């Protein structure tokens, strides 16, 4: 009974049967939700503007090295000059 | 982030499941990022030096 930043929210959704409905209490973060108009009743901020699709749980969001290599009949020139101020004529090319 | 969360899976429709936050166990704390204070003062100094000329 006394920062806040998060909400112990609830709602009712669809269950395995479209005939039946189910209530579940979850939690959400601030700014993910903004007020509508006692007992606070809230709303997902995205439903006001665009759709929503949950990301897959087994998808790795860690960035790994991705080389960009040239096709056949082309070549990527890299500059080897250390002090390449702006963009000009790089003398040391590979 | 110091929050110790829990996967609460709730079946929506036939197979899909909505993974939400349960009750946070073991205290609640704010997320933070540390930066080496001594190491940052040297980097802001090297930048202002080469911006100078």
């Amino acid at each position, epitope marked *: *009974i*006394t920062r806040t930043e998060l909400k112990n929210c609830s709602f009712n959704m669809t269950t395995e049967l479209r005939d039946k409905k189910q209530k579940v209490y979850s939690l959400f973060y601030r700014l993910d939700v903004v007020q509508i108009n006692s007992n606070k009743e809230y709303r997902l901020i995205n439903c006001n503007t665009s759709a929503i699709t949950q990301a897959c749980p087994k998808v790795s969001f860690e960035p790994i090295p991705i080389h960009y290599c040239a096709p056949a009949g082309f070549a990527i020139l890299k500059c080897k000059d250390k002090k390449f101020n702006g963009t000009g004529p790089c003398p040391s090319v590979s | 982030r*110091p929050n110790n969360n829990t996967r609460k899976s709730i079946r929506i429709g036939p197979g899909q499941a909505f993974y939400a936050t349960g009750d946070i166990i073991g*205290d*609640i*704390r*704010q997320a*933070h990022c540390n930066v080496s204070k001594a190491t940052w003062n040297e980097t802001l100094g090297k930048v202002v030096k080469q911006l100078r000329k």
Partner: antibody
Amino acid sequence: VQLRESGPGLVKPSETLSLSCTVSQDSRPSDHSWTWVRQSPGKALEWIGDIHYNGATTYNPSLRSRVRIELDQSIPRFSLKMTSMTAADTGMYYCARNAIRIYGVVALGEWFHYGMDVWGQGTAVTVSS
Amino acid sequence: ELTQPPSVSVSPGQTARITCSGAPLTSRFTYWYRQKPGQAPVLIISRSSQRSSGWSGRFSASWSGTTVTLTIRGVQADDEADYYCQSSDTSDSYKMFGGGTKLTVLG
């Protein structure tokens, strides 16, 4: 753990009074914030301000002009001061520790107050010429 | 300007009820302590987590809108002294003091 007062415990109304307290055999004295309290002869407890090895200055707003607390970073000496106001309020002044535990990261607002958990031997102070 | 009563009593071996009313009762929590005459007060109840602190059997606490509830153990015998009450302002600066109730046991 141990903590006992110091000083004379008596003064005339015109001259500033200054007393101290000594903590020892404490596992960690630096982080814990401490404050002093007084008990009027009418058995009405009162609050004077907190202070920290951090160097934080705070007192009761009704006694701001009188009190000015000092600190000793080397060995914990808990000096206290009271200048303009002296008479009537005279009674049993105490020595205490306002224990502090942490629920995470300092300077982030994660240092909840445990409250007063150890006190001093107890001393009495009255004004009478 | 918090308010703690100073004169209530109850029978020994019965549950009692200690209150302390004040508007700055949010970021303040509650102190009380029982100072036996001529002695030093001790921890009435102590915060060892941000959730709650009524684990020990002897005492428990409840929270209302402004008044705070200091419930106590079933037996009220042998332990008697005046119970003060202390808290801190919203700016986390200042500690209010406002008296406390001396309790006497019948029989």
